[PDB]
């Protein structure tokens, strides 16, 4: 039983695996898994519960916090403006954010008496899109700089806005001279701020007009509307013993409020069908059902390794993206990119691109096989289980042409 | 006379060569040689005797000790379970064999007072499939560690079982920190033990159900059944003067008994037609006559060079696989892989994969030319003559398109 | 929507929107002429703003522009036509054809005219001339005592300057470095023009006319603007602080209107978008347009290769301003730049993209992977001022919808 | 417009114009025979000037030429025919077939016959012979005490010389270096010829005739010119100062007209453009011409690969004159040079272009990317004198018009 | 040296002008030896330390010492210092002065 060169009986191992290894033993609440090849959806399965407390099951239309899977959407948004001539990647950020002209590199000291050295060159927009800015994230919990992000709540918090992020970051140091290393950052939240600066629109309006309406994604937003809140999943966090506990109730969630923070880095709620339509648009070279969000050639450029000398993340990453899963994987303008299949120790193709969210949401596009996967669950953090590698083994196992 | 772009008159040089250089001068007892291209068998020749003492000739259906040619079959078996999500290659072995958690690297001393250092990282399943474990073989005869394997008879002997191997190896050191070198090992025997752990079946039953029955291989087994023992060849060993002497009588062979040792590394008896069906299945991307043993993509992954930085065996091998014949040849998940044709000093194609047995059995698959060869003889050891390189010269010489 | 040769014409309209919003309305450029072609079809052609601000005259399709250093690919084609006839080899020493140059030496120290020199490791070759690895320089570089000597002798141009004077003066000057060991943009292409003359027996304007302009149907390309075409000749502007510009060359009163006796293979030509399009399209086709062949397919493929050592980019070998970030991942062949690494260049495009530019902000490229090309004309010195040629690449590559 | 197989025949006429203007009229060469083929079709064939100046005899299509070192590809094919029959392996030691060579040692110091030696890291292999990494040399190298010993023993050729004498004398001489660690052009191909004899049971002239010349229809290729064909045999000339030449070998009373006992796999053959064309075309086709097969398609593909370590060019490994600029970006396989990097070579052509030359300025190449080939015949020693083979490449590649 | 008559870093060709254009051996047999330019001229310090690039006939290693032997520059019938200096002016050096050491007629 074969569609688009995929054995559907082999794809049934996905549901068998998620039941046996995660759902029955109580490691995940529930899952939504979609696989497509050559434009055809060949697998779509909801399993377990979206809300354990209320015994509500996962459905095709269940809404999920996709978190950092927001970043590819923000990256597409900014590259739409690149295609209109609005900026160049090698332009300094301080051309658009002049208060950032004299950013300096951390040397020593605690906030707010941090001493700094001059950088070799100013931060560029390419540095923002590739996380080579020298910016960081509060949750990194490694350096005095991310300690300053936490005391100023730059990851989010009451009264946080993009305007406050840009203003606070102007008076903070960088982990390193821009371009000389890689560190996962609020840089994509800054990219969102640049979409606003250049388009004249707030980020929710830019996304709606130039991405969600054209692709037919009616269930993707920064704020879950009151009338759709019944469909919104609960979020769970890891507990010792391979268990989980309630982390966010859908009723009385900050995702249900219009607080003033539009996070290009982690803000969006979506569903498997909406993210599938985004992913399929990219797999097609930027077009779905006569709507174009990006040029074929612009997207090809975003999918290239933009790290120096075709290095992988572990050759440049100062932190946790140094670890064995990211071996043979580079980074472009908002996507990871597989460079070396054997080195990654995971079956796949050179050029496989995608990203993930910290609640264990994942997607990839294999341009060699014209194959893609969207996986939705709500378990923080994504570092907990290697479910996204097991799914790659089963899905690549189902190719039979 | 040309079939599948091969001149059959040029292929007749095989039989002329094996007669002139080996059979008439009494260097080999007998040979069975098969060549196929694009799904079509273009050469099949039995020559000389399977049993010199009893004057019995080699026939198409003659049974041969294929030894280390068992390893690709064991590798396919374990990768079938990879495709079901049952493990990941970068997982530690001690996750499945917990007694192995505190394995350490040899420093100095004789068994049983060997001193050890901490390894930089624990052994992984990828390390087992690629012989980068730090495990070894008794017959290596190079180090105090392989001396301990010999005094404990871990290569085989009276009362030996997979359960005993895993138990003894838990109290022995490694030649080196896992991943940091290559050394041919009992690792594939351990892979067989993991097929058992994960499937719930003994290895002979897993092979029968998931490989031999589907491919139509009724003459491949760990134990030769009583009613087929008439077809079983004698095994010969090298003697000075380019001669040979009886090493194993087929009547009263340990291969005719069900002793308790199922060797994923060296145990199987087979015939040219059965191994042809396995080889042709691989050449086709894992399918023969509607039966699938492995996914096309999973097999493509096993055929890649899994050595660090695309190095050849001589750049990482601590032992005999360091020598000139293995120049320009890497190693994947149970197969050698040609990297550089000129450097190997042997005609062929980049990507040529296969392996050999210590009784001078050999097979290869050239994925560039869709060409393959199965060669059967019984002369220990395989290091004696370069017959497998002469056959490559003749076979590649017969391509006429 | 409206698609020609796999290009969305609505997406290509962003070119005109961009040049208006970013350059013309704010008064950074006087006027622009932009042409884009793919698979032999012109898919974009737009004049905007003024060719002469003082006289309120608009840019038209037929407006004539100082293309300057975009002369160099034409001179390079001319010399490679003679390579195809067996007249020289690239690894031959220049002094075989210019014997007075046999004892050229490398700058060590001193001011003109008491410059001390060292022996070069090897003599200058013709390949060194075509790739700017000669060790020659330009007066306008303003970096070294050697380019100071070029300026005091007016070797970039000036009253009574001829190719014969350049070759004679260069014989008594030192090189910035031992030939082949570095890259420095130079009068080398002016010397290439002198070699076209030596080998063909013709003056450069006659060689270009007979062997390139007549065959390709380029009637509006010349070293001297004829009296009867001077109405069509654009003014040249130079940058002023505040992202402004001032008159640099009045068309009526221009040295480009006189036959002053310097035929510059490096910077001399005046042309128009249609003439340079026909040259560019000929190259994109492998050296042929409408049955006329200016170069062999294979000879051109050879000119488009990276001729720098060890497949290095300009910043790994360039001693000067071509060291800077825009030329990262870009090499150099026989008269063209060549893109090596798209990500490294930080600009969308294809490996193999070739072309060059003029110091008045004229630019052209040919993408052989996409069979795409662009000719961009404006008159604003210097071209280092604005990154307009990168913005145009972003918009044009953005319009591909295959 | 004459176009055959994507080649402009008007552009190919530049060959004859060039050889007249640059070589024949000025008296640098006596005469030339030039053939060019593409996709199986001969597109150029021109005799020019004289085969014998003293007797005023012109060059004809059927003129016989000393092809010298262009013998080596034929000897290489002969030995690889036996590789295909399983008779040897490339990584086997030579001393397995020539046991007297087991204790060969590397030159340290001293003059013949009191040369001191060191142990080699490994014994010489057959791959070392086919790639000139043996450590053997040639008398005419005139660089080392070892080639001085070759000259005093006349191992390049001389009265009473035979292959049997070469193998016997070489057993008592040292190597320039430990086998595999460098490249030096050598008598190694003469030794390959000796191995064709050892393995086949036939003398080399009989092996060539039966297994190469008869099958391909090459009736005018031999070690000895038969009496009835001596009228067709060209004179050989050597360079004289002033770009002139002098008689080096009279065809009447030539050693090439005698059956002396020396069958040179390295330099012995006389042939003609048509015979060498048939050999070249057989190789361009993958080892087959008009139903006759001399070598397997795959075996030939293996001979055309770079067999130097780490994909190095000749200048990265060559101890001698093949270190110089013309061999930049060129490697070496089993009897052929192989182009690696077109730009680096400074000569138009394709990656994979293979061929070789003779010391009397005979040359051939096969471009497998363009399915193009050339055979060029003249008699002017030495081939290092003029760059005619690079000029011909420029004109021939210039004639591609698809 | 102590009387101020020369300095060690002075070129030899200051005192032996025929030696100004000495060149380094590349290839060939005497008397048709091809040569390359040296990086710097031979100095008196090079003579006193055997870093000249000169050699001795008896070395029996190179084509250059073969030329010394056929010209009997180590000694023999009619040999004088005047003949050594005259013959050495027309011979190549084993290497560019200063870049190696080779025991020689330098003394
Ligand atoms: P992403 O899911 C991080 C985005 C949101 C973090 C703010 C608390 O990382 C993979
Ligand atoms: P294989 O044939 C080794 C098989 C196990 C032998 C144990 C004595 O090695 C190439
Ligand atoms: P080109 O436009 C240099 C032309 C010569 C100018 C001499 C005054 O440089 C990019
Ligand atoms: P070949 O033509 C060398 C032939 C041997 C010459 C014997 C003196 O070298 C390119």
Author numbering:
A (entry chain D), B (entry chain B): 9 to 409
C (entry chain C), D (entry chain A): 8 to 409
E (entry chain G): 90 to 196
Copy out sentences from the published article reporting this entry, exactly as the authors wrote them.
Family VIII esterases present similarities to class C β‐lactamases, which show nucleophilic serines located at the S‐X‐X‐K motif instead of the G‐X‐S‐X‐G or G‐D‐S‐(L) motif shown by other carboxylesterase families. Indeed, the analysis of the substrate specificity revealed its capacity to hydrolyse nitrocefin as a model chromogenic cephalosporin substrate (40.4 ± 11.4 units·g−1), and a large battery of 66 structurally different esters (up to 1730 min−1), including bis(2‐hydroxyethyl)‐terephthalate (241.7 ± 8.5 units·g−1) and the mycotoxin T‐2 (1220 ± 52 units·g−1). It also showed acyltransferase activity through the synthesis of benzyl 3‐oxobutanoate (40.4 ± 11.4 units·g−1) from benzyl alcohol and vinyl acetoacetate.
These unique structural elements in combination with docking experiments allowed us to gain valuable insights into the substrate specificity of this esterase and possible others belonging to family VIII.
